[PDB]
């Protein structure tokens, strides 16, 4: 059975894929505006439909190898969708589609981070639950990535914003979905791991947005990244301690508040020079 | 004062991207004057950028011996061990660029990820 | 797991809230219909998707403080869609999408009402329950 | 020789406008030569670039001692004085400069204006 | 070592297309080291790039007694000599550069077009 279960998320893996990449080249060897949006919208709806199919026929196996397979079919199928989109939506002198670029990069993100764990959630060997770990945190990492490069790309100030909300909210789902499978490992050497995945991750949100807030005077995009960076340094100590709460070997404790307040430096320096702009 | 001149050479083609040059002139000045912490830590500076991370290491730790605050230098003692691949130090210098300098956002980064990296 | 769980519905809540706001204003200070078509389908197309994902989460709810939580951001969700839209799609002459709307309105209606039930079926206790009936209830008299 | 190369060095610094160079490279090569009036001339100059008004006075003064018919040393002399407010002085090096050079259009607008400023 | 100084300044300014302080600092440290086969020969490349022909033959000429296996220098000889209508000489020595390096297209031109014009 597992087989058989595994055979079909390979075989709409693979179509989709083709999709994809299909219709990125229909809508990239054209001049005109409406067929890249239709390539945007029709790569994002078609991503997020199988990733969902993938779901309900992954549910029904219960071996870890084949759960693995079937995160690794939707991690590469949304990574795959997200680069479509940002080769596919760049340019357009930065006045043309660009919130439906972000937009549709961070739900793709969301619907994958959310598939993911609700797979890896069944896992039960803390190996496989790392695995699951690292998925999110790059598909996470890939999304920022994509959103922060499309508005340096700017060329005016236009939704700078979008990009800074879209940053911090995908940082703090994935943080908490971290979190979430993380709660269900038992030995320090992974808790740990699990502790350095949402630090870097909020380093890297907090880094995105304060890069993009301090590229040009803008006080009102100073405001909403100064939320942003203490909202996200607020959750990723908070999943911290939580994890860290469950250590009791001492020397993964120390090194764990070494880690918080790294994160709570990063929020404050970045902070401050946000504030003085 | 040839060392003077030795060390005005060096400086200038540093400054205009010689690395070339500027590290025979800086070997120059300093075989006259090796308390001269500034050209120690241009020197490792110039090997740092063509890549040469043995030779950053050892005259970043001469210019540090001679000057222990130069901040920058431990910062960019840290990312020669990183490059290659010494987390354990690369932790140890990135702490000290920030105690001496607390707005070193990029330390606090290279920091984190060496101690990714660690064990 | 259940404060988790609980957060992670109300940040995608408090998003897809925010987002449907934006989208009637975008197109409420147009005078292209064609914008506030695409501003219909996109707070409908949005809300059917936040409700399927709060759904998807709120099955990990055993605990029925959190379970209320889940129908609770549901139901405003839905009802916000259904306001915006209805003052979204208003006028036209009454020519020009009423169409959309009504369908609009009556699916998102149709989803949350049976999302409501699949996750007040798990609970034991006769007030919750009599909360969720609360819940079908308005849904259904607004729309 | 010293002396030479420091000059060229100050000369090629100063053509780079690499001023803080330039003024180091022109020193040596003037502790070594102190008649070389060309030396003393740029070492004022770099000053001046730099807003150092009173140093480049006193170089450009030394040159001109070593070279009278330096107009373009007399031009500049005048002008870091009418900087100053010296517009006395910045008349009478004016006028010398246009004795020199009577083509040089700045220095009668300059010396006109000095005339303004004066009294 | 001045004289190491004195070629560093002279290649920094070569490079940097500064031809009057690279030729001055060449003949400083070729004066203190005649052997240096380099210095001559950008010695004379920078003649070369002024027109000074006549200089740029000579010292080409020396740095090849010391490297005769310098095919660009060999080539450049020919430049110089082809330049001022010695075809008998410019054709011998493209023949010199391309024995040492047949890849050298510009050689086979030029020398082909040194036949044209030679008797």
């Known amino acids: 059975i597992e087989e058989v279960v595994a055979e079909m998320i390979d075989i709409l893996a693979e179509s989709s894929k083709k999709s994809i990449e299909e219709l990125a080249r229909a809508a990239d060897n054209k001049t005109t505006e409406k067929a890249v949006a239709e390539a945007i919208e029709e790569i994002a709806r078609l991503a997020?439909?199988?990733?969902?199919?993938?779901?309900?026929?992954?549910?029904?196996?219960?071996?870890?190898?084949?759960?693995?397979?079937?995160?690794?079919?939707?991690?590469?199928?949304?990574?795959?969708?997200?680069?479509?989109?940002?080769?596919?939506?760049?340019?357009?002198?930065?006045?043309?589609?660009?919130?439906?670029?972000?937009?549709?990069?961070?739900?793709?993100?969301?619907?994958?981070?959310?598939?993911?764990?609700?797979?890896?959630?069944?896992?039960?060997?803390?190996?496989?639950?790392?695995?699951?770990?690292?998925?999110?945190?790059?598909?996470?990492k890939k999304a920022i990535e994509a959103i922060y490069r499309l508005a340096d790309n700017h060329t005016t100030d236009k939704?700078?914003?979008?990009?800074?909300?879209?940053?911090?909210?995908?940082?703090?789902?994935?943080?908490?979905?971290?979190?979430?499978?993380?709660?269900?490992?038992?030995?320090?050497?992974?808790?740990?791991?699990?502790?350095?995945?949402?630090?870097?991750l909020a380093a890297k949100a907090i880094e995105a947005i304060y890069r993009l807030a301090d590229n040009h005077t803008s006080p009102t995009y100073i405001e909403?990244?100064?939320?942003?960076?203490?909202?996200?340094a607020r959750k990723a100590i908070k999943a911290i301690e939580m994890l860290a709460k469950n250590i009791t070997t001492e020397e993964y404790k120390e090194k764990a508040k070494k880690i918080i307040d790294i994160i709570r430096k990063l929020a404050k320096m970045a902070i401050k020079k946000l504030e003085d702009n | 004062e040839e060392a003077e001149l030795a060390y005005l050479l060096g400086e200038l083609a540093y400054k205009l991207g010689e690395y070339r040059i500027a590290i025979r002139a800086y070997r120059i000045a300093l075989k006259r004057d090796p308390n001269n912490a500034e050209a120690w830590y241009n020197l490792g500076n110039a090997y740092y950028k063509q890549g040469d991370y043995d030779e950053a290491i050892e005259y970043y730790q001469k210019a540090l011996e001679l000057?222990?605050?130069?901040?920058?230098?431990?910062?960019?003692?840290?990312?020669?061990?990183?490059?290659?691949?010494?987390?354990?130090?690369?932790?140890?210098?990135?702490?000290?660029?920030?105690?001496?300098?607390?707005?070193?956002?990029?330390?606090?980064?290279?920091?984190?990820?060496?101690?990714?990296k660690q064990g």
């Open chain 1, 159 to 200: 939704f700078m914003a979008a990009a800074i909300e879209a940053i911090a909210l995908l940082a703090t789902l994935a943080i908490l979905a971290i979190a979430l499978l993380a709660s269900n490992h038992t030995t320090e050497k992974f808790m740990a791991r699990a502790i350095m995945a949402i630090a870097i």
């Open chain 2, 67 to 116: 000057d222990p605050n130069n901040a920058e230098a431990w910062y960019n003692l840290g990312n020669a061990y990183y490059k290659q691949g010494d987390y354990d130090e690369a932790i140890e210098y990135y702490e000290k660029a920030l105690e001496l300098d607390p707005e070193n956002l990029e330390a606090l980064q290279n920091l984190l990820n060496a101690m990714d």
């Open chain 1, 48 to 140: 997020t439909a199988a990733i969902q199919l993938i779901e309900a026929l992954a549910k029904n196996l219960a071996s870890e190898e084949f759960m693995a397979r079937a995160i690794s079919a939707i991690a590469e199928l949304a990574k795959k969708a997200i680069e479509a989109i940002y080769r596919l939506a760049d340019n357009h002198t930065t006045d043309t589609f660009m919130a439906r670029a972000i937009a549709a990069i961070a739900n793709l993100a969301v619907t994958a981070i959310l598939a993911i764990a609700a797979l890896a959630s069944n896992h039960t060997t803390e190996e496989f639950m790392a695995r699951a770990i690292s998925a999110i945190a790059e598909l996470a």
């Open chain 1, 224 to 232: 909403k990244a100064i939320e942003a960076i203490e909202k996200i």
